[PDB]
A paper describes a structure:
Proteins containing a FIC domain catalyze AMPylation and other post-translational modifications (PTMs). Among these, Bartonella effector proteins (Beps) comprise a particularly diverse ensemble of FIC domains that subvert various host cellular functions. The FIC fold comprises eight conserved α-helices and encompasses a characteristic active site loop between helices α4 and α5 that forms most of the catalytic center and the substrate binding pocket. Additionally, FIC domains generally contain a β-hairpin between helix α2 and helix α3 that is referred to as the “flap” and mediates docking of a target segment in extended conformation via β-strand augmentation.
The structures of Bhe_BepA, Bcl_Bep1, Bqu_BepC, and Btr_BepC exhibit all features defining a FIC AMP transferase as described in the first chapter and elsewhere. However, BepC proteins are special in that they have a lysine instead of a Mg2+-coordinating aspartate/glutamate in the FIC motif. Thus, BepC proteins appear to require no divalent cation for substrate binding, in contrast to all FIC AMP transferases characterized so far. For the FIC domain of BepC with its non-canonical FIC signature motif, no enzymatic activity has been found although it binds to the RhoGEF GEF-H1 and activates this signaling protein by relocalization to the plasma membrane. For BepC, despite its canonical signature motif, no catalytic activity has yet been found, but its BepFIC domain mediates protein–protein interaction with the RhoGEF GEF-H1, thereby activating RhoA signaling. Bqu_BepC FIC with ADP crystals were grown from a solution of 15% w/v PEG 3350 and 0.1 M sussinic acid. For all structures except Bqu_BepC FIC with ADP, the structure was solved by using a molecular replacement with Phaser.
Author numbering: 1 to 214
């Protein structure tokens, strides 16, 4: 029942802060704003902890001017200013059999990822090949958790950019198409094939000057 409360009454337009009722216009406005917020967010230093709180902070920075629920995961009830409450504990990509994390799996998976990152020292001290493989595993874990109602891709990509930066690697998603990212995501989650994601991260990553100069 509560998932309908993400939309205006009898509409396919997500409730938003921009004053927009046209779903196409909302998409374009949001795309432009999240791109700009990403440019500005890149100026912020990477944190010492790459945790679920940080992921929520990224989503909030990218989306708070668009959605009231920016930074809030979809397992959690969210009450809009209009007094209605929304959430969406279960989500499955269209056309596909394998769903994203359901309900409390979202928190459990983000906790497991946090622990893995801590154990691996945020992927510091790796070879280029190792870093790419490990970054791909982190990304597929994020993909499955899919913690937000919308905006997961933009965030996950920002989380990776900052994780990379703190580990001495530049990860540049602009080097590839959306289609390639989608393909790699589908292969990993729908077809249990982790290779395309590994190749993707190899292709868009290089060690930074400092990591070379050291
Ligand atoms: N069928 C799928 N199975 C698993 N992951 C997918 C699938 N399709 C897309 N993805 C990935 O899910 C993530 C979120 O996609 P995105 O386009 O940001 O949607 P949203 O805005 O709904 O969160 C991206 O990393 C994307 O590549
Ligand atoms: Mg997105």
């Amino acid at each position: 029942h509560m998932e309908h409360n993400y939309f205006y009454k009898n509409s396919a337009t997500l409730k938003n802060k921009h004053g927009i009722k046209n779903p196409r216009k909302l998409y374009e406005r949001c795309a432009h704003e999240t791109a700009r917020e990403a440019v500005n967010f890149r100026l912020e230093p990477p944190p010492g902890k790459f945790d679920a709180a940080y992921l929520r902070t990224i989503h909030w920075c990218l989306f708070h001017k668009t959605f009231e629920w920016a930074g809030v995961t979809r397992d959690q009830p969210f009450t809009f200013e209009d007094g209605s409450t929304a959430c969406m504990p279960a989500m499955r990509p269209k056309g596909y059999k394998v769903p994203f994390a359901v309900g409390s799996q979202i928190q459990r998976e983000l906790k497991k990822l946090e622990q893995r990152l801590t154990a691996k020292n945020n992927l510091q001290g790796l070879s280029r090949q190792e870093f790419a493989a490990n970054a791909a595993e982190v990304f597929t874990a994020l993909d499955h958790a899919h913690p937000f109602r919308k905006g997961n891709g933009r965030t996950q990509r920002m989380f990776m950019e900052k994780l990379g930066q703190a580990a001495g690697y530049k990860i540049d998603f602009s080097l590839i198409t959306k289609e390639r990212m989608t393909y790699a995501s589908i292969e990993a989650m729908q077809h249990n094939n982790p290779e395309p994601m590994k190749d993707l991260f190899e292709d868009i990553t290089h060690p930074q000057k400092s990591l070379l100069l050291k």
